[PDB]
Structure 1
Amino acid sequence: SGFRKMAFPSGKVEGCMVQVTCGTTTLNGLWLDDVVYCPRHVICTSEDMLNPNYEDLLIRKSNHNFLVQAGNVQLRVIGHSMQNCVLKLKVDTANPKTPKYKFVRIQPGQTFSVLACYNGSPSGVYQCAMRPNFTIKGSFLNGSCGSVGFNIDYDCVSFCYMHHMELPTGVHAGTDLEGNFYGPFVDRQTAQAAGTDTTITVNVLAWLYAAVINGDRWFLNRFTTTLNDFNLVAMKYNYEPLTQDHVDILGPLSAQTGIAVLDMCASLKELLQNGMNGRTILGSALLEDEFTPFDVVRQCSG
């Protein structure tokens, strides 16, 4: 295959990472203008973390309890509040490296880059896909909370994920930057299982379009299907149903190849019902579901 998981350049986010310490708990925070955003569990002790009373724990905190540092330089906290599972610390200095930015809440299937950070210091960058069960397959060690996920469009950074926890199967969960968890998880030190996962159909379809663009088109059959017929079949193979939004985001690739979205669905349906018959697509007997239609365009054209 000529495809890579490619992250966005991380510099505009690196300039925003700080560390936040309460007591002995240190994690990362995101400094945009004069506010630092971080997971609210920084205020917890190990006695509190099994079912912390966050409202009562916060009552006992003052601005002077929070150690915010850019490197070893302390930023003075002048205000604090909690929004869902995120703490917002107002600081007395506006970050001069603040990029143009937005906070967005993504859907399952969408991809984003994660800048993994420890002690406020960026350590690595990689691309993740939000699964249908609202987990991501990250590489996150102790101290990585507050690391963020983002996309960049025309030098505007859209922040979509802030890291909070690791589930029993090793996958990761977190919130948007308004502090609302993706998925049913809660920020307590308790066993919480990731639900059963499914395959991201819209992204498999994008991958089949990528194959066609590259001349690998043996699977294009002569059938079509309806969207409802397809969704009912797909669910029997543990594939996600398509939404109208998914049909629309496939528009550009459909136009580029001249293959109708519903014809491509009929092709995928044959692959599901009959297997690959030993053949390969883009040099693989596995269908790939972590490349979105935008990722394909971002790589096939460019």
Structure 2
Amino acid sequence: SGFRKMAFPSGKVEGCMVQVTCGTTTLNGLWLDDVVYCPRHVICTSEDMLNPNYEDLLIRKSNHNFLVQAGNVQLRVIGHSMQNCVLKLKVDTANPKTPKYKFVRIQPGQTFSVLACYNGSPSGVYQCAMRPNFTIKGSFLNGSCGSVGFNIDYDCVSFCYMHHMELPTGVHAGTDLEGNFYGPFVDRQTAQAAGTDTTITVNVLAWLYAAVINGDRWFLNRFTTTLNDFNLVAMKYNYEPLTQDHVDILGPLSAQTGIAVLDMCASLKELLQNGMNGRTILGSALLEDEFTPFDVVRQCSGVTFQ
């Protein structure tokens, strides 16, 4: 019993973190096979960031302008290429720790683990959701760039996020491992606005089910509702609209708990119209939307990874 924000074990990712230095800049990179992946703005200086011409800036760089360090091992760079906002340094040694991996571009509403790193050294791990507006609410200081987010499925690391920048609101933005940002953001030293955000309605319901699984039930109504009228209540409160595809995903949780998706929606309605009364659900005074249906199940059924 009990229910926590839980990150994946970070071992397989730790063996892939190096420090990349270009000129005065140093940030983190991801060492897979004989390629190191890092944010392209490692080639910019202090001024370049205002509006960099990266193609021009990278043309002025050669292979030996890059120092890649895996602990104390010095990898020689033997080729360099720029894919979208990601720089790829081809090195001479294939990382012996390379796990089975994929590159994956995740959908809004999905979750992943972040291994926050500084100078190529892991500092901590935590779980995040890709918000509907393509930002994340994490913990990154100067030098955290090139820290990566990932999911582990059995034996395979799925990398989905590489950190690039922080916004004025204090949320975070980055790219997939192919270098394309999530959201409308660009890698220049500018103030950029993410969208209005919305609450991930499907995740909020998966967490209410997690709550029921774990003995919390004070919020369960008798009343029921309709997918159409609930969405009228969703939109008034900034929740992404609940689709029938969402009902079917929520299906095994609705099934395990014996509580119809529609019925749960009505309990959610009252919570939204009526607040929480100074009460708590799974130790929070707010509705949590950073657990997917799959995260609830994996945690509530004890999934492990090889």
Could you state the TM-score of these two structures normalised by the residue count of structure 2? 0.92
Could you give the per-residue CA deviations for residues 109-162 of structure 1, whole angstroms, max 9, x where no partner exists? 222111111111111111112222221121111111000001111021111110
Does the 8 Å contact 2:109/2:131 carry over to 1? Answer: yes
Secondary structure of the structure 1 residue equivalent to 2:229? helix
Q: In the superposition, relative to structure 1, how do residues 233 and 68 fare at CA in structure 2: closer, same or farther (>3 Å)?
A: same
In the alignment, which residue of structure 1 is the partner of 2:112? Answer: 112
Q: Quote the offset at 1:68 in angstroms.
A: 1.0
* 2: CA distance, partners of 1:73 / 1:267: 57
Q: In the superposition, relative to structure 1, how do residues 278 and 138 fare at CA in structure 2: closer, same or farther (>3 Å)?
A: closer
Q: In the superposition, relative to structure 1, how do residues 244 and 81 fare at CA in structure 2: closer, same or farther (>3 Å)?
A: farther
Does the 8 Å contact 2:3/2:214 carry over to 1? Answer: no
Secondary structure of the structure 2 residue equivalent to 1:235? helix
After TM superposition, the structure 1 stretch with the greater mean CA deviation from structure 2, 238-247 or 144-153, is 238-247
After TM superposition, the structure 1 stretch with the greater mean CA deviation from structure 2, 98-107 or 240-249, is 240-249
Could you give the per-residue CA deviations for residues 75-97 of structure 1, whole angstroms, max 9, x where no partner exists? 11121111111111111111111
* 2: CA distance, partners of 1:12 / 1:139: 21
Could you give the per-residue CA deviations for residues 153-190 of structure 1, whole angstroms, max 9, x where no partner exists? 10211111100001112211111111111111110001
* 2: CA distance, partners of 1:226 / 1:34: 54
Could you give the per-residue CA deviations for residues 19-78 of structure 1, whole angstroms, max 9, x where no partner exists? 111111000000111111110001111221111011111122222221111112211112
Secondary structure of the structure 1 residue equivalent to 2:48? coil
After TM superposition, the structure 1 stretch with the greater mean CA deviation from structure 2, 65-74 or 112-121, is 65-74
* 1: CA distance, partners of 2:15 / 2:284: 39
Secondary structure of the structure 2 residue equivalent to 1:222? coil
Q: In the superposition, relative to structure 1, how do residues 9 and 63 fare at CA in structure 2: closer, same or farther (>3 Å)?
A: same
Cα RMSD after superposing both structures: 1.8
After TM superposition, the structure 1 stretch with the greater mean CA deviation from structure 2, 286-295 or 152-161, is 286-295
In the alignment, which residue of structure 2 is the partner of 1:36? Answer: 36
Q: In the superposition, relative to structure 1, how do residues 246 and 37 fare at CA in structure 2: closer, same or farther (>3 Å)?
A: farther
Q: Quote the offset at 1:103 in angstroms.
A: 1.0
Q: In the superposition, relative to structure 1, how do residues 233 and 134 fare at CA in structure 2: closer, same or farther (>3 Å)?
A: same
Q: Quote the offset at 1:226 in angstroms.
A: 3.6
Q: Quote the offset at 1:192 in angstroms.
A: 1.2
Q: In the superposition, relative to structure 1, how do residues 277 and 166 fare at CA in structure 2: closer, same or farther (>3 Å)?
A: closer
* 2: CA distance, partners of 1:47 / 1:83: 23
Percent identity over paired residues: 100
Q: Quote the offset at 1:215 in angstroms.
A: 3.1
Show the 5 A alignment for 1:70-109. Answer: 70-109=70-109
Q: Quote the offset at 1:262 in angstroms.
A: 2.5
Show the 5 A alignment for 1:118-197. Answer: 118-197=118-197
After TM superposition, the structure 1 stretch with the greater mean CA deviation from structure 2, 51-60 or 246-255, is 246-255
Q: Which runs of 5+ in 2 are unaligned?
A: none
Secondary structure of the structure 2 residue equivalent to 1:267? helix
* Residues 1:268 and 2:300 are matched in the alignment: no
* 2: CA distance, partners of 1:53 / 1:279: 53
In the alignment, which residue of structure 2 is the partner of 1:250? Answer: 250
Does the 8 Å contact 2:64/2:77 carry over to 1? Answer: yes
Secondary structure of the structure 1 residue equivalent to 2:49? coil
* 1: CA distance, partners of 2:277 / 2:30: 49
Secondary structure of the structure 2 residue equivalent to 1:112? strand
Does the 8 Å contact 2:3/2:210 carry over to 1? Answer: no
Q: Quote the offset at 1:279 in angstroms.
A: 4.8
After TM superposition, the structure 1 stretch with the greater mean CA deviation from structure 2, 9-18 or 284-293, is 284-293
Secondary structure of the structure 1 residue equivalent to 2:113? strand
Q: In the superposition, relative to structure 1, how do residues 25 and 277 fare at CA in structure 2: closer, same or farther (>3 Å)?
A: closer
* 2: CA distance, partners of 1:217 / 1:41: 49
Could you give the per-residue CA deviations for residues 173-232 of structure 1, whole angstroms, max 9, x where no partner exists? 111111111111110001112332222211110111112212333433344444343233
After TM superposition, the structure 1 stretch with the greater mean CA deviation from structure 2, 87-96 or 273-282, is 273-282
* 2: CA distance, partners of 1:272 / 1:77: 55
Residues matched between the structures, number: 302
Q: In the superposition, relative to structure 1, how do residues 243 and 51 fare at CA in structure 2: closer, same or farther (>3 Å)?
A: farther
* 2: CA distance, partners of 1:226 / 1:101: 42
